[PDB]
Amino acid sequence: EYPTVSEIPVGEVRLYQIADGVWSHIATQSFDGAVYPSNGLIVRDGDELLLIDTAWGAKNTAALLAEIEKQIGLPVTRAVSTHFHDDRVGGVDVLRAAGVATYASPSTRRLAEVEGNEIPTHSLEGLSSSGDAVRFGPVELFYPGAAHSTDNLVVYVPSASVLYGGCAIYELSRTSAGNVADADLAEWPTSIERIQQHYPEAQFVIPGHGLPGGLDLLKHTTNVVKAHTNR
Numbered sequence: 001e002y003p004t005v006s007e008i009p010v011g012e013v014r015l016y017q018i019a020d021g022v023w024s025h026i027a028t029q030s031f032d033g034a035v036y037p038s039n040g041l042i043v044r045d046g047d048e049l050l051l052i053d054t055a056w057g058a059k060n061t062a063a064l065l066a067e068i069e070k071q072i073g074l075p076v077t078r079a080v081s082t083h084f085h086d087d088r089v090g091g092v093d094v095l096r097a098a099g100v101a102t103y104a105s106p107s108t109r110r111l112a113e114v115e116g117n118e119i120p121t122h123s124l125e126g127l128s129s130s131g132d133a134v135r136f137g138p139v140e141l142f143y144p145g146a147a148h149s150t151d152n153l154v155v156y157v158p159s160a161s162v163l164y165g166g167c168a169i170y171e172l173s174r175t176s177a178g179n180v181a182d183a184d185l186a187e188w189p190t191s192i193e194r195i196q197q198h199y200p201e202a203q204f205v206i207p208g209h210g211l212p213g214g215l216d217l218l219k220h221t222t223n224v225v226k227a228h229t230n231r
């Protein structure tokens with residue numbers, strides 16, 4: 001049902017409808033001779049769409065916009081990037097050229113600039129302290145604390161009970177840590193517990209990469225992070 005790497009030729013994007021007015025977008029990138037999938041989210045708001053995260057690169061993100069137009073046919077008016085790495089902001093210049101207003105926390109914008117990555121235009125206030133949440137159109141944005149990165153956000157869609165964890169939440173099939181170069185391993189389990197406490201009613205949990213599941217992805221991620229901590 002949910003698409004996997006082998007179904008998606010590089011440069012193509014698939015959409016997967018999770019619930020009424022909520023999709024994930026799935027793309028792939030090649031790095032170091034392997035192929036990686038990546039997810040983001042699309043949430044309908046009235047007659048417009050909110051996009052969560054790029055499709056990891058300019059060409060993928062242009063394909064994402066073309067697929068949205070072909071399959072959904074509503075304008076993407078705003079986009080949020082959930083942390084500063086290229087799988088989240090790579091493609092922001094494509095979004096901007098297409099007239100999408102791009103957003104990230106000020107912490108994410110700063111880190112993206114230091115990294116030489118693309119920088120979303122607008123700064124999301126009210127997300128600087130662990131446990132902070134703000135409404136943004138049809139979603140709640142939540143800063144759980146440092147985890148995969150110090151700036152990582154998660155996104156909850158209340159009407160659909162969909163929680164998008166981004167790269168702070170791992171799919172079940174991943175049993176070792178990813179790239180954790182910018183992670184706060186010490187705080188990651190506490191940040192995951194904040195997500196659990198704030199969204200205990202979540203019915204669908206979307207990781208940054210790979211297959212959706214339920215809230216079980218949170219404790220799975222904590223297990224992987226603690227095992228890596230003790231490596």
Ligand SMILES: O=C(N[C@@H](c1ccccc1O)P(=O)(O)O)c1scc2c1CCCC2
Pocket residue numbers: 036085086087088167178179180181182208
């Ligand atoms: O987008 C990035 N990495 C994502 C990623 C996706 C699939 C497989 C591996 C992987 O690292 P992720 O770690 O954000 O999930 C990039 S690009 C340049 C860097 C990074 C991460 C930190 C070091 C410098």
Ligand SMILES: [Mg+2]
Pocket residue numbers: 081082083103104105106108109151153
């Ligand atoms: Mg941000």
Ligand SMILES: [Zn+2]
Pocket residue numbers: 083085148149167
């Ligand atoms: Zn990352």
Ligand SMILES: [Zn+2]
Pocket residue numbers: 087167208209
């Ligand atoms: Zn990632």
